[PDB]
């Protein structure tokens, strides 16, 4: 009942961004830049939005933060960059 959140310390969630989260972020940015969002990573004349998003993820300048839930109801969050992508 007390504000149902947590500081960015003492976080018990895994430090590895999971494949579901990967696909979600990729699709979200694909739709985002798809309908003319501001782009951040320099293009190479590559037209496909989804591959642009993948290049952004590899280059790691994604301006997103990921929300995270626990069965109790209290939530937790992360920023994309502090996660590490391996999968």
């Amino acid at each position: 009942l007390k504000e149902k959140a947590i500081p960015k310390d003492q976080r018990a969630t895994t430090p590895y961004m999971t494949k579901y989260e990967r696909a979600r972020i990729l699709g979200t940015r694909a739709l985002q830049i798809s309908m003319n969002a501001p782009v951040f990573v320099d293009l190479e004349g590559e037209t496909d939005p989804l591959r642009i998003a993948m290049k952004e993820l590899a280059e790691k300048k994604i301006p997103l933060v990921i929300r995270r839930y626990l069965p109790d109801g209290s939530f937790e969050d992360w920023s994309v960059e502090e996660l590490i992508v391996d999968l």
Binding site: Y20, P63, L64, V65, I66, R67, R68, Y69, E81
Partner: protein
């Protein structure tokens, strides 16, 4: 001991031919059946008549009568089950849905 024996039996049945499958599946099955203080068969009236969301229950072998019972008891559902979303036509907290997608400003400021 009951769950142990039941797992043994079902593993025997499956391994009788065309074996096999990983132990974890059977373990999960026997447990989710037995975590009730007893045991319950998977019938129209074994597990379905148990404290659980309304719609997902009514989506199996018990069409309307269950709704009547719900309305009479006037209970409520929080719709955190997959069915409840599906009937409700909203993204259920599944896979990609198991988390929210949140936005930040400060990173946007930092990298312009």
């Amino acid at each position: 001991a009951g769950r142990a024996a039941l797992y043994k039996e079902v593993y025997n049945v499956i391994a009788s031919d065309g074996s096999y499958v990983n132990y974890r599946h059977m373990a999960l099955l026997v447990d989710v059946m037995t975590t009730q203080g007893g045991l319950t068969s998977v019938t129209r009236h074994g597990f379905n008549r148990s404290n659980t969301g309304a719609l997902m229950r009514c989506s199996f072998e018990e069409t309307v009568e269950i709704l009547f019972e719900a309305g009479a008891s006037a209970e409520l559902d929080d719709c955190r089950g997959v069915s409840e979303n599906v009937i409700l036509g909203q993204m259920a907290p599944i896979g990609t849905g198991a988390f929210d997608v949140m936005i930040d400003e400060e990173s946007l400021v930092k990298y312009m």
